[PDB]
């Protein structure tokens, strides 16, 4: 059948699709990302993300872990700067107790102090594993230098805050952001009815709108990290459109025109205007792409470069110059059509998997409360037109930039030189 939606009177969104899949997936989406902290409770969302297997009012940690592993199901937590999503999946004959476990974890945690004291070492280990690659550190640095208050908060807990996060901070964060008006329960392979019954036994008691977050403010700037890596990583972004505008579609078409990942293994990603503009001048190994991260109040669009330290300068300059050409109208309609085809194929392959489909429905729910059929999107992406793309470009080419660099930065340029 099709997707089916009810908005409960306490604000909770219920979305269901019954496709008679053998494994069914049920997720719950909360607007409780890392942007809702301030300077007093930094890293609380990271410990909340890692604290999904703790003792709840209704099931202990042992009961939750052994009961999910007894049926072979999976419980995972994915977190962005805006949203958290707790997802369980398993056989249709065990999803009743899977919803019991998931809704107990979402609605009634206990946050015992010895459990979080044991979890803080796992927090340090998870942060080290996450920052084992340079892209994660340079994106966290880029957000920290790009924003002032809200989106500048890191996804991972700072080093000083480990050992300082308490049970009361987790309880305050849950009581202020895990309310029914910020939650959507999305189920693929389940009946809509059951979602509702579990949405009344749970998800209905906490029904405020919660604590409203601050508006994110752009700051500009640049933070660098000399650490002696073999490759220089550099991200240069500017403020862009937010979630809910056609200029966001223009910026997505702009990154697929500039280059948003290789389609061929071992390809040179020939088309990418960026990749072409770098490769016509530099014979060193490189990786140049376009970065776009848009959240419900603000967006970041820019370029991302990995290169040899020595060439790091002009490669960045070459990439920047290519965007300036797009800001001068130097583009062809066939290139924009190919960018639109790449963007729509990427969207359809993102929603072709079950967990990606459940995430998409989830995101749409929290964001606009409505489901937008894949088809609808296709025609809206088509709405973006050439001039629109050019426009977004000039926004990037003019707006104050924010630069995060890491590596041997002896030949990496600055923003006033860039």
């Amino acid at each position: 059948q099709d997707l089916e939606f009810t908005k409960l009177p306490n604000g909770l969104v219920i979305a269901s699709l019954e496709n008679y899949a053998p494994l069914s997936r049920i997720g719950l989406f909360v607007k409780a990302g890392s942007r809702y902290e301030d300077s007093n409770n930094l890293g609380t969302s990271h410990l909340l993300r890692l604290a999904s297997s703790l003792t709840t009012k209704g099931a202990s940690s042992f009961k939750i872990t052994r009961g999910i592993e007894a049926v072979g199901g999976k419980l995972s937590v994915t977190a962005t700067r805006e949203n958290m999503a707790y997802t369980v999946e398993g056989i249709r004959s065990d999803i009743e107790i899977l919803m019991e476990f998931l809704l107990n974890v979402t609605t009634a945690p206990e946050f015992r102090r010895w459990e979080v004291a044991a979890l803080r070492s796992q927090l340090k280990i998870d942060k080290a594993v996450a920052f084992q690659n340079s892209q994660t550190r340079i994106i966290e640095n880029l957000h920290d230098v790009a924003y002032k208050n809200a989106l500048a908060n890191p996804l991972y807990c700072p080093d000083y805050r480990m050992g300082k996060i308490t049970s009361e901070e987790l309880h305050y964060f849950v009581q202020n952001h895990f309310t029914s008006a910020r939650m959507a329960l999305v189920g693929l392979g389940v009946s809509h009815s059951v979602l509702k019954q579990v949405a009344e036994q749970f998800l209905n008691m906490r029904g405020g709108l919660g604590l409203a977050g601050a508006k994110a403010k752009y700051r500009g700037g640049e933070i660098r990290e000399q650490n002696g890596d073999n490759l220089v990583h550099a991200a240069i972004v500017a403020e862009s459109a937010a979630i809910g505008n056609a200029e966001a579609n223009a910026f997505s078409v702009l990154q697929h025109l500039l280059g948003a990942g290789p389609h061929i293994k071992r390809g040179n990603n020939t088309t990418s205007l960026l990749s072409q503009s770098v490769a016509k001048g530099s014979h060193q190994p490189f990786d140049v792409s376009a970065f776009n991260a848009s959240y419900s109040d603000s967006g970041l669009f820019g370029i991302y470069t990995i290169s040899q330290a020595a060439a790091a300068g002009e490669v960045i300059n070459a990439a920047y110059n290519q965007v300036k050409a797009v800001a001068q109208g130097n583009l062809s309609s066939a290139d924009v059509q190919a960018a639109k085809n790449k963007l729509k194929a990427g969207y359809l392959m993102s929603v072709e998997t079950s967990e990606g489909f459940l995430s998409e429905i989830g995101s749409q729910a929290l964001a606009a409360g409505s489901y937008m059929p894949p088809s609808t999107v296709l025609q809206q992406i088509d709405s973006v037109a050439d001039a629109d793309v050019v426009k977004a470009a000039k926004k990037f080419v003019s707006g104050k930039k924010s630069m995060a660099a890491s590596g041997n930065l002896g030949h990496t340029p600055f923003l006033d030189e860039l």
């Binding site: 993300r49 872990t65 419980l75 995972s76 962005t80 084992q132 892209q135 994106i139 990583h233 792409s289």
Partner: peptide
Amino acid sequence: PVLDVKRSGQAAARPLVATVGLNVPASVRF
């Protein structure tokens, strides 16, 4: 120090999304 259990080069072009849970795997994607 050892980064617990050590091991990408592909440059990020999309926002990051941490991921952890009961299952042993845990990582981030752009």
